[PDB]
JSON list of C-alpha atoms in Angstrom, two decimals:
[
{"chain": "A", "resi": 1, "resn": "UNK", "atom": "CA", "xyz": [-9.54, 9.29, 16.65]},
{"chain": "A", "resi": 2, "resn": "UNK", "atom": "CA", "xyz": [-7.18, 10.79, 14.07]},
{"chain": "A", "resi": 3, "resn": "UNK", "atom": "CA", "xyz": [-8.70, 13.45, 11.80]},
{"chain": "A", "resi": 4, "resn": "UNK", "atom": "CA", "xyz": [-5.65, 15.36, 10.61]},
{"chain": "A", "resi": 5, "resn": "UNK", "atom": "CA", "xyz": [-2.27, 14.18, 9.24]},
{"chain": "A", "resi": 6, "resn": "UNK", "atom": "CA", "xyz": [-0.60, 12.09, 11.97]},
{"chain": "A", "resi": 7, "resn": "UNK", "atom": "CA", "xyz": [1.68, 9.11, 12.51]},
{"chain": "A", "resi": 8, "resn": "UNK", "atom": "CA", "xyz": [3.13, 7.12, 15.34]},
{"chain": "A", "resi": 9, "resn": "UNK", "atom": "CA", "xyz": [3.30, 3.59, 16.68]},
{"chain": "A", "resi": 10, "resn": "UNK", "atom": "CA", "xyz": [0.76, 1.55, 18.61]},
{"chain": "A", "resi": 11, "resn": "UNK", "atom": "CA", "xyz": [1.00, -2.04, 19.84]},
{"chain": "A", "resi": 12, "resn": "UNK", "atom": "CA", "xyz": [4.15, -2.43, 17.78]},
{"chain": "A", "resi": 13, "resn": "UNK", "atom": "CA", "xyz": [2.66, -1.18, 14.51]},
{"chain": "A", "resi": 14, "resn": "UNK", "atom": "CA", "xyz": [3.47, 2.03, 12.66]},
{"chain": "A", "resi": 15, "resn": "UNK", "atom": "CA", "xyz": [0.39, 3.98, 11.73]},
{"chain": "A", "resi": 16, "resn": "UNK", "atom": "CA", "xyz": [-0.38, 6.98, 9.61]},
{"chain": "A", "resi": 17, "resn": "UNK", "atom": "CA", "xyz": [-3.30, 9.08, 8.37]},
{"chain": "A", "resi": 18, "resn": "UNK", "atom": "CA", "xyz": [-2.33, 11.28, 5.45]},
{"chain": "A", "resi": 19, "resn": "UNK", "atom": "CA", "xyz": [-4.43, 13.50, 3.24]},
{"chain": "A", "resi": 20, "resn": "UNK", "atom": "CA", "xyz": [-4.07, 16.75, 1.30]},
{"chain": "A", "resi": 21, "resn": "UNK", "atom": "CA", "xyz": [-7.63, 18.00, 1.78]},
{"chain": "A", "resi": 22, "resn": "UNK", "atom": "CA", "xyz": [-10.96, 16.63, 2.96]},
{"chain": "A", "resi": 23, "resn": "UNK", "atom": "CA", "xyz": [-12.79, 15.03, 5.92]},
{"chain": "A", "resi": 24, "resn": "UNK", "atom": "CA", "xyz": [-10.96, 11.95, 7.31]},
{"chain": "A", "resi": 25, "resn": "UNK", "atom": "CA", "xyz": [-11.13, 9.89, 10.45]},
{"chain": "A", "resi": 26, "resn": "UNK", "atom": "CA", "xyz": [-8.99, 6.91, 11.61]},
{"chain": "A", "resi": 27, "resn": "UNK", "atom": "CA", "xyz": [-8.93, 4.80, 14.75]},
{"chain": "A", "resi": 28, "resn": "UNK", "atom": "CA", "xyz": [-6.02, 2.46, 15.46]},
{"chain": "A", "resi": 29, "resn": "UNK", "atom": "CA", "xyz": [-6.55, -0.73, 17.47]},
{"chain": "A", "resi": 30, "resn": "UNK", "atom": "CA", "xyz": [-4.10, -3.46, 18.54]},
{"chain": "A", "resi": 31, "resn": "UNK", "atom": "CA", "xyz": [-2.43, -5.85, 16.15]},
{"chain": "A", "resi": 32, "resn": "UNK", "atom": "CA", "xyz": [-2.29, -3.39, 13.32]},
{"chain": "A", "resi": 33, "resn": "UNK", "atom": "CA", "xyz": [-6.08, -3.22, 13.09]},
{"chain": "A", "resi": 34, "resn": "UNK", "atom": "CA", "xyz": [-7.69, 0.13, 12.26]},
{"chain": "A", "resi": 35, "resn": "UNK", "atom": "CA", "xyz": [-10.92, 1.68, 10.98]},
{"chain": "A", "resi": 36, "resn": "UNK", "atom": "CA", "xyz": [-11.25, 4.64, 8.69]},
{"chain": "A", "resi": 37, "resn": "UNK", "atom": "CA", "xyz": [-13.81, 6.70, 6.79]},
{"chain": "A", "resi": 38, "resn": "UNK", "atom": "CA", "xyz": [-13.43, 9.58, 4.32]},
{"chain": "A", "resi": 39, "resn": "UNK", "atom": "CA", "xyz": [-15.48, 12.16, 2.33]},
{"chain": "A", "resi": 40, "resn": "UNK", "atom": "CA", "xyz": [-15.04, 15.27, 0.31]},
{"chain": "A", "resi": 41, "resn": "UNK", "atom": "CA", "xyz": [-11.34, 14.42, -0.09]},
{"chain": "A", "resi": 42, "resn": "UNK", "atom": "CA", "xyz": [-8.88, 14.82, -2.96]},
{"chain": "A", "resi": 43, "resn": "UNK", "atom": "CA", "xyz": [-6.43, 12.16, -1.81]},
{"chain": "A", "resi": 44, "resn": "UNK", "atom": "CA", "xyz": [-6.26, 10.33, 1.51]},
{"chain": "A", "resi": 45, "resn": "UNK", "atom": "CA", "xyz": [-4.32, 7.28, 2.84]},
{"chain": "A", "resi": 46, "resn": "UNK", "atom": "CA", "xyz": [-4.84, 5.30, 6.01]},
{"chain": "A", "resi": 47, "resn": "UNK", "atom": "CA", "xyz": [-2.34, 2.62, 6.91]},
{"chain": "A", "resi": 48, "resn": "UNK", "atom": "CA", "xyz": [-0.60, 0.48, 9.60]},
{"chain": "A", "resi": 49, "resn": "UNK", "atom": "CA", "xyz": [2.46, -1.72, 9.18]},
{"chain": "A", "resi": 50, "resn": "UNK", "atom": "CA", "xyz": [6.17, -2.12, 9.93]},
{"chain": "A", "resi": 51, "resn": "UNK", "atom": "CA", "xyz": [9.30, -0.08, 9.35]},
{"chain": "A", "resi": 52, "resn": "UNK", "atom": "CA", "xyz": [12.50, -1.80, 8.01]},
{"chain": "A", "resi": 53, "resn": "UNK", "atom": "CA", "xyz": [15.40, 0.30, 6.85]},
{"chain": "A", "resi": 54, "resn": "UNK", "atom": "CA", "xyz": [16.98, -2.70, 5.11]},
{"chain": "A", "resi": 55, "resn": "UNK", "atom": "CA", "xyz": [17.81, -3.70, 1.56]},
{"chain": "A", "resi": 56, "resn": "UNK", "atom": "CA", "xyz": [14.98, -5.70, 0.05]},
{"chain": "A", "resi": 57, "resn": "UNK", "atom": "CA", "xyz": [17.33, -8.46, -1.08]},
{"chain": "A", "resi": 58, "resn": "UNK", "atom": "CA", "xyz": [18.14, -9.53, 2.55]},
{"chain": "A", "resi": 59, "resn": "UNK", "atom": "CA", "xyz": [14.57, -9.44, 3.97]},
{"chain": "A", "resi": 60, "resn": "UNK", "atom": "CA", "xyz": [14.02, -13.13, 3.19]},
{"chain": "A", "resi": 61, "resn": "UNK", "atom": "CA", "xyz": [10.38, -13.98, 2.98]},
{"chain": "A", "resi": 62, "resn": "UNK", "atom": "CA", "xyz": [7.84, -11.47, 4.17]},
{"chain": "A", "resi": 63, "resn": "UNK", "atom": "CA", "xyz": [4.10, -12.49, 4.29]},
{"chain": "A", "resi": 64, "resn": "UNK", "atom": "CA", "xyz": [1.20, -10.35, 5.34]},
{"chain": "A", "resi": 65, "resn": "UNK", "atom": "CA", "xyz": [-2.00, -12.16, 6.22]},
{"chain": "A", "resi": 66, "resn": "UNK", "atom": "CA", "xyz": [-4.80, -9.61, 6.30]},
{"chain": "A", "resi": 67, "resn": "UNK", "atom": "CA", "xyz": [-8.55, -9.40, 6.48]},
{"chain": "A", "resi": 68, "resn": "UNK", "atom": "CA", "xyz": [-10.71, -6.29, 5.82]},
{"chain": "A", "resi": 69, "resn": "UNK", "atom": "CA", "xyz": [-14.28, -4.96, 5.69]},
{"chain": "A", "resi": 70, "resn": "UNK", "atom": "CA", "xyz": [-13.77, -2.73, 2.70]},
{"chain": "A", "resi": 71, "resn": "UNK", "atom": "CA", "xyz": [-16.57, -0.37, 1.55]},
{"chain": "A", "resi": 72, "resn": "UNK", "atom": "CA", "xyz": [-15.47, 2.36, -0.83]},
{"chain": "A", "resi": 73, "resn": "UNK", "atom": "CA", "xyz": [-18.17, 4.40, -2.52]},
{"chain": "A", "resi": 74, "resn": "UNK", "atom": "CA", "xyz": [-15.83, 5.51, -5.34]},
{"chain": "A", "resi": 75, "resn": "UNK", "atom": "CA", "xyz": [-12.23, 5.60, -6.46]},
{"chain": "A", "resi": 76, "resn": "UNK", "atom": "CA", "xyz": [-10.25, 3.76, -3.78]},
{"chain": "A", "resi": 77, "resn": "UNK", "atom": "CA", "xyz": [-7.66, 0.96, -3.21]},
{"chain": "A", "resi": 78, "resn": "UNK", "atom": "CA", "xyz": [-7.13, -1.67, -0.47]},
{"chain": "A", "resi": 79, "resn": "UNK", "atom": "CA", "xyz": [-3.48, -2.50, -0.76]},
{"chain": "A", "resi": 80, "resn": "UNK", "atom": "CA", "xyz": [-0.04, -3.30, 0.66]},
{"chain": "A", "resi": 81, "resn": "UNK", "atom": "CA", "xyz": [1.74, -0.06, 0.39]},
{"chain": "A", "resi": 82, "resn": "UNK", "atom": "CA", "xyz": [5.32, 1.11, 1.14]},
{"chain": "A", "resi": 83, "resn": "UNK", "atom": "CA", "xyz": [8.38, 3.00, 0.31]},
{"chain": "A", "resi": 84, "resn": "UNK", "atom": "CA", "xyz": [11.97, 2.36, -0.87]},
{"chain": "A", "resi": 85, "resn": "UNK", "atom": "CA", "xyz": [14.86, 4.85, -0.80]},
{"chain": "A", "resi": 86, "resn": "UNK", "atom": "CA", "xyz": [17.96, 4.85, -3.09]},
{"chain": "A", "resi": 87, "resn": "UNK", "atom": "CA", "xyz": [16.03, 4.75, -5.30]},
{"chain": "A", "resi": 88, "resn": "UNK", "atom": "CA", "xyz": [13.06, 6.58, -3.89]},
{"chain": "A", "resi": 89, "resn": "UNK", "atom": "CA", "xyz": [10.00, 4.55, -4.90]},
{"chain": "A", "resi": 90, "resn": "UNK", "atom": "CA", "xyz": [6.42, 4.39, -3.65]},
{"chain": "A", "resi": 91, "resn": "UNK", "atom": "CA", "xyz": [5.05, 0.91, -4.30]},
{"chain": "A", "resi": 92, "resn": "UNK", "atom": "CA", "xyz": [1.59, -0.86, -4.27]},
{"chain": "A", "resi": 93, "resn": "UNK", "atom": "CA", "xyz": [0.24, -4.44, -4.24]},
{"chain": "A", "resi": 94, "resn": "UNK", "atom": "CA", "xyz": [-3.52, -3.75, -4.91]},
{"chain": "A", "resi": 95, "resn": "UNK", "atom": "CA", "xyz": [-5.86, -6.41, -3.61]},
{"chain": "A", "resi": 96, "resn": "UNK", "atom": "CA", "xyz": [-9.16, -4.61, -4.13]},
{"chain": "A", "resi": 97, "resn": "UNK", "atom": "CA", "xyz": [-10.43, -1.23, -5.35]},
{"chain": "A", "resi": 98, "resn": "UNK", "atom": "CA", "xyz": [-13.45, 0.90, -5.89]},
{"chain": "A", "resi": 99, "resn": "UNK", "atom": "CA", "xyz": [-14.96, 1.72, -9.31]},
{"chain": "A", "resi": 100, "resn": "UNK", "atom": "CA", "xyz": [-11.59, 1.97, -11.10]},
{"chain": "A", "resi": 101, "resn": "UNK", "atom": "CA", "xyz": [-8.87, -0.67, -11.35]},
{"chain": "A", "resi": 102, "resn": "UNK", "atom": "CA", "xyz": [-5.52, 1.14, -11.05]},
{"chain": "A", "resi": 103, "resn": "UNK", "atom": "CA", "xyz": [-3.19, 2.53, -12.11]},
{"chain": "A", "resi": 104, "resn": "UNK", "atom": "CA", "xyz": [-3.89, 3.71, -15.71]},
{"chain": "A", "resi": 105, "resn": "UNK", "atom": "CA", "xyz": [-0.56, 2.74, -17.29]},
{"chain": "A", "resi": 106, "resn": "UNK", "atom": "CA", "xyz": [0.92, 0.22, -19.68]},
{"chain": "A", "resi": 107, "resn": "UNK", "atom": "CA", "xyz": [1.06, -3.28, -18.19]},
{"chain": "A", "resi": 108, "resn": "UNK", "atom": "CA", "xyz": [4.53, -4.82, -17.95]},
{"chain": "A", "resi": 109, "resn": "UNK", "atom": "CA", "xyz": [3.15, -8.36, -17.71]},
{"chain": "A", "resi": 110, "resn": "UNK", "atom": "CA", "xyz": [1.22, -10.68, -15.46]},
{"chain": "A", "resi": 111, "resn": "UNK", "atom": "CA", "xyz": [2.37, -13.01, -12.71]},
{"chain": "A", "resi": 112, "resn": "UNK", "atom": "CA", "xyz": [0.71, -15.48, -10.38]},
{"chain": "A", "resi": 113, "resn": "UNK", "atom": "CA", "xyz": [1.45, -14.85, -6.67]},
{"chain": "A", "resi": 114, "resn": "UNK", "atom": "CA", "xyz": [-0.44, -16.17, -3.67]},
{"chain": "A", "resi": 115, "resn": "UNK", "atom": "CA", "xyz": [-2.95, -17.88, -6.02]},
{"chain": "A", "resi": 116, "resn": "UNK", "atom": "CA", "xyz": [-3.81, -14.57, -7.66]},
{"chain": "A", "resi": 117, "resn": "UNK", "atom": "CA", "xyz": [-3.07, -13.03, -11.05]},
{"chain": "A", "resi": 118, "resn": "UNK", "atom": "CA", "xyz": [-1.49, -9.61, -10.92]},
{"chain": "A", "resi": 119, "resn": "UNK", "atom": "CA", "xyz": [-0.57, -7.10, -13.73]},
{"chain": "A", "resi": 120, "resn": "UNK", "atom": "CA", "xyz": [2.68, -5.21, -13.08]},
{"chain": "A", "resi": 121, "resn": "UNK", "atom": "CA", "xyz": [2.96, -1.46, -13.75]},
{"chain": "A", "resi": 122, "resn": "UNK", "atom": "CA", "xyz": [5.39, 1.37, -13.49]},
{"chain": "A", "resi": 123, "resn": "UNK", "atom": "CA", "xyz": [4.22, 4.93, -13.16]},
{"chain": "A", "resi": 124, "resn": "UNK", "atom": "CA", "xyz": [5.99, 8.31, -12.38]},
{"chain": "A", "resi": 125, "resn": "UNK", "atom": "CA", "xyz": [5.07, 11.11, -10.05]},
{"chain": "A", "resi": 126, "resn": "UNK", "atom": "CA", "xyz": [6.49, 14.61, -10.54]},
{"chain": "A", "resi": 127, "resn": "UNK", "atom": "CA", "xyz": [6.92, 16.98, -7.60]},
{"chain": "A", "resi": 128, "resn": "UNK", "atom": "CA", "xyz": [4.55, 15.14, -5.28]},
{"chain": "A", "resi": 129, "resn": "UNK", "atom": "CA", "xyz": [4.33, 14.51, -1.57]},
{"chain": "A", "resi": 130, "resn": "UNK", "atom": "CA", "xyz": [6.65, 11.77, -0.28]},
{"chain": "A", "resi": 131, "resn": "UNK", "atom": "CA", "xyz": [8.43, 10.45, 2.84]},
{"chain": "A", "resi": 132, "resn": "UNK", "atom": "CA", "xyz": [11.24, 12.92, 2.18]},
{"chain": "A", "resi": 133, "resn": "UNK", "atom": "CA", "xyz": [9.26, 15.99, 1.00]},
{"chain": "A", "resi": 134, "resn": "UNK", "atom": "CA", "xyz": [8.20, 17.15, -2.38]},
{"chain": "A", "resi": 135, "resn": "UNK", "atom": "CA", "xyz": [9.92, 14.94, -4.89]},
{"chain": "A", "resi": 136, "resn": "UNK", "atom": "CA", "xyz": [9.82, 13.15, -8.24]},
{"chain": "A", "resi": 137, "resn": "UNK", "atom": "CA", "xyz": [9.84, 9.38, -8.12]},
{"chain": "A", "resi": 138, "resn": "UNK", "atom": "CA", "xyz": [8.42, 6.27, -9.71]},
{"chain": "A", "resi": 139, "resn": "UNK", "atom": "CA", "xyz": [5.72, 3.95, -8.36]},
{"chain": "A", "resi": 140, "resn": "UNK", "atom": "CA", "xyz": [5.76, 0.19, -8.86]},
{"chain": "A", "resi": 141, "resn": "UNK", "atom": "CA", "xyz": [2.51, -1.72, -8.94]},
{"chain": "A", "resi": 142, "resn": "UNK", "atom": "CA", "xyz": [1.12, -5.26, -8.82]},
{"chain": "A", "resi": 143, "resn": "UNK", "atom": "CA", "xyz": [-2.68, -5.08, -9.37]},
{"chain": "A", "resi": 144, "resn": "UNK", "atom": "CA", "xyz": [-4.81, -8.14, -8.88]},
{"chain": "A", "resi": 145, "resn": "UNK", "atom": "CA", "xyz": [-7.09, -9.08, -11.87]},
{"chain": "A", "resi": 146, "resn": "UNK", "atom": "CA", "xyz": [-10.07, -9.59, -9.53]},
{"chain": "A", "resi": 147, "resn": "UNK", "atom": "CA", "xyz": [-10.90, -8.20, -6.06]},
{"chain": "A", "resi": 148, "resn": "UNK", "atom": "CA", "xyz": [-9.87, -9.80, -2.77]},
{"chain": "A", "resi": 149, "resn": "UNK", "atom": "CA", "xyz": [-10.28, -8.46, 0.78]},
{"chain": "A", "resi": 150, "resn": "UNK", "atom": "CA", "xyz": [-8.69, -11.22, 2.81]},
{"chain": "A", "resi": 151, "resn": "UNK", "atom": "CA", "xyz": [-5.79, -13.60, 2.36]},
{"chain": "A", "resi": 152, "resn": "UNK", "atom": "CA", "xyz": [-1.98, -13.63, 2.40]},
{"chain": "A", "resi": 153, "resn": "UNK", "atom": "CA", "xyz": [0.37, -11.48, 0.34]},
{"chain": "A", "resi": 154, "resn": "UNK", "atom": "CA", "xyz": [3.95, -12.66, -0.01]},
{"chain": "A", "resi": 155, "resn": "UNK", "atom": "CA", "xyz": [5.34, -9.11, -0.41]},
{"chain": "A", "resi": 156, "resn": "UNK", "atom": "CA", "xyz": [8.83, -10.27, -1.27]},
{"chain": "A", "resi": 157, "resn": "UNK", "atom": "CA", "xyz": [7.53, -12.31, -4.22]},
{"chain": "A", "resi": 158, "resn": "UNK", "atom": "CA", "xyz": [6.17, -9.10, -5.76]},
{"chain": "A", "resi": 159, "resn": "UNK", "atom": "CA", "xyz": [9.53, -7.37, -5.09]},
{"chain": "A", "resi": 160, "resn": "UNK", "atom": "CA", "xyz": [11.25, -10.17, -7.05]},
{"chain": "A", "resi": 161, "resn": "UNK", "atom": "CA", "xyz": [8.59, -10.11, -9.85]},
{"chain": "A", "resi": 162, "resn": "UNK", "atom": "CA", "xyz": [9.16, -6.37, -10.18]},
{"chain": "A", "resi": 163, "resn": "UNK", "atom": "CA", "xyz": [12.95, -6.68, -10.09]},
{"chain": "A", "resi": 164, "resn": "UNK", "atom": "CA", "xyz": [12.79, -9.34, -12.92]},
{"chain": "A", "resi": 165, "resn": "UNK", "atom": "CA", "xyz": [11.15, -6.78, -15.11]},
{"chain": "A", "resi": 166, "resn": "UNK", "atom": "CA", "xyz": [13.56, -3.94, -14.47]},
{"chain": "A", "resi": 167, "resn": "UNK", "atom": "CA", "xyz": [11.75, -2.26, -11.54]},
{"chain": "A", "resi": 168, "resn": "UNK", "atom": "CA", "xyz": [14.48, -2.04, -8.95]},
{"chain": "A", "resi": 169, "resn": "UNK", "atom": "CA", "xyz": [14.14, -1.28, -5.29]},
{"chain": "A", "resi": 170, "resn": "UNK", "atom": "CA", "xyz": [16.64, -0.16, -2.70]},
{"chain": "A", "resi": 171, "resn": "UNK", "atom": "CA", "xyz": [16.33, 0.19, 1.00]},
{"chain": "A", "resi": 172, "resn": "UNK", "atom": "CA", "xyz": [12.81, -0.67, 2.14]},
{"chain": "A", "resi": 173, "resn": "UNK", "atom": "CA", "xyz": [11.57, 2.07, 4.49]},
{"chain": "A", "resi": 174, "resn": "UNK", "atom": "CA", "xyz": [8.15, 0.59, 5.42]},
{"chain": "A", "resi": 175, "resn": "UNK", "atom": "CA", "xyz": [5.60, -2.02, 4.32]},
{"chain": "A", "resi": 176, "resn": "UNK", "atom": "CA", "xyz": [1.98, -1.42, 5.32]},
{"chain": "A", "resi": 177, "resn": "UNK", "atom": "CA", "xyz": [-1.69, -2.48, 4.79]},
{"chain": "A", "resi": 178, "resn": "UNK", "atom": "CA", "xyz": [-3.35, 0.56, 3.36]},
{"chain": "A", "resi": 179, "resn": "UNK", "atom": "CA", "xyz": [-6.71, 2.03, 2.36]},
{"chain": "A", "resi": 180, "resn": "UNK", "atom": "CA", "xyz": [-6.50, 4.88, -0.19]},
{"chain": "A", "resi": 181, "resn": "UNK", "atom": "CA", "xyz": [-9.22, 7.12, -1.55]},
{"chain": "A", "resi": 182, "resn": "UNK", "atom": "CA", "xyz": [-9.33, 9.62, -4.33]},
{"chain": "A", "resi": 183, "resn": "UNK", "atom": "CA", "xyz": [-12.12, 12.19, -4.72]},
{"chain": "A", "resi": 184, "resn": "UNK", "atom": "CA", "xyz": [-14.64, 9.83, -3.17]},
{"chain": "A", "resi": 185, "resn": "UNK", "atom": "CA", "xyz": [-16.04, 8.70, 0.17]},
{"chain": "A", "resi": 186, "resn": "UNK", "atom": "CA", "xyz": [-16.02, 5.38, 1.90]},
{"chain": "A", "resi": 187, "resn": "UNK", "atom": "CA", "xyz": [-15.35, 3.33, 4.99]},
{"chain": "A", "resi": 188, "resn": "UNK", "atom": "CA", "xyz": [-13.15, 0.32, 5.92]},
{"chain": "A", "resi": 189, "resn": "UNK", "atom": "CA", "xyz": [-12.29, -1.72, 8.90]},
{"chain": "A", "resi": 190, "resn": "UNK", "atom": "CA", "xyz": [-9.01, -3.73, 8.84]},
{"chain": "A", "resi": 191, "resn": "UNK", "atom": "CA", "xyz": [-9.58, -6.64, 11.18]},
{"chain": "A", "resi": 192, "resn": "UNK", "atom": "CA", "xyz": [-6.25, -8.46, 10.66]},
{"chain": "A", "resi": 193, "resn": "UNK", "atom": "CA", "xyz": [-2.79, -7.38, 9.59]},
{"chain": "A", "resi": 194, "resn": "UNK", "atom": "CA", "xyz": [-0.28, -10.07, 10.66]},
{"chain": "A", "resi": 195, "resn": "UNK", "atom": "CA", "xyz": [3.38, -9.96, 9.51]},
{"chain": "A", "resi": 196, "resn": "UNK", "atom": "CA", "xyz": [5.60, -12.97, 9.21]},
{"chain": "A", "resi": 197, "resn": "UNK", "atom": "CA", "xyz": [9.29, -12.71, 8.22]},
{"chain": "A", "resi": 198, "resn": "UNK", "atom": "CA", "xyz": [11.61, -15.74, 7.73]},
{"chain": "A", "resi": 199, "resn": "UNK", "atom": "CA", "xyz": [14.66, -16.42, 5.61]}
]
C-alpha cells in the first residue's frame, strides 16, 4: 500500500496520496476504487480520478457516479476534488464530512444540483502546497446541506453554478473523488467512481 506521498495511474485512473505530516495508508484497486485510513495527521488527501488539460467550457457534461464507505472520526471531507490552471484554483464539491461542515466562509448562495442543495463558497489560500508548488490561489466550493455518500455528481453543473456567481475556472487539470482529513483519524473505502462524459 501507499504510506508516503505518491501518485500514478492504475486501471486508467490517476491516483494520489498527499499529506504534510502523519500516518497514512492507501490501497488502489481497479475502476478508481481505493481504501484509505489516517491518524495523527495535520492534513491528508487520498484520491483517484481523471486528468483533462482542457478548458472547462468545452468538457460538455461530466457526471461522476460514486459510492463510498466513509467513516471519519473527526474533521474530514468526502468530495469531488480537482484543479484548474490559468487561473490556478483548487475546487471542491463536498458530499459528506466529519464533525464540521466546510469551509468556514461567507456563502455566495444555494443551488439545487443532482437533487441536492449546495451552498457555494470562495476561499483563499496563501503560500500553500499546490500542483505547481508553493502558491497563493483561491478555492471554489459547493457544500451539500446534508450528508450523502453515494449518488451522481454532475461536476460541470457546479462549474456553471460557480461561473454564474463570478467564480471563474480555466483549464481543468484533474477531477477526482477524494477523502480529506484534518487533524483527525478515520477510514474510508471508495467502492465506485465511474466517470461519464458526453456533450
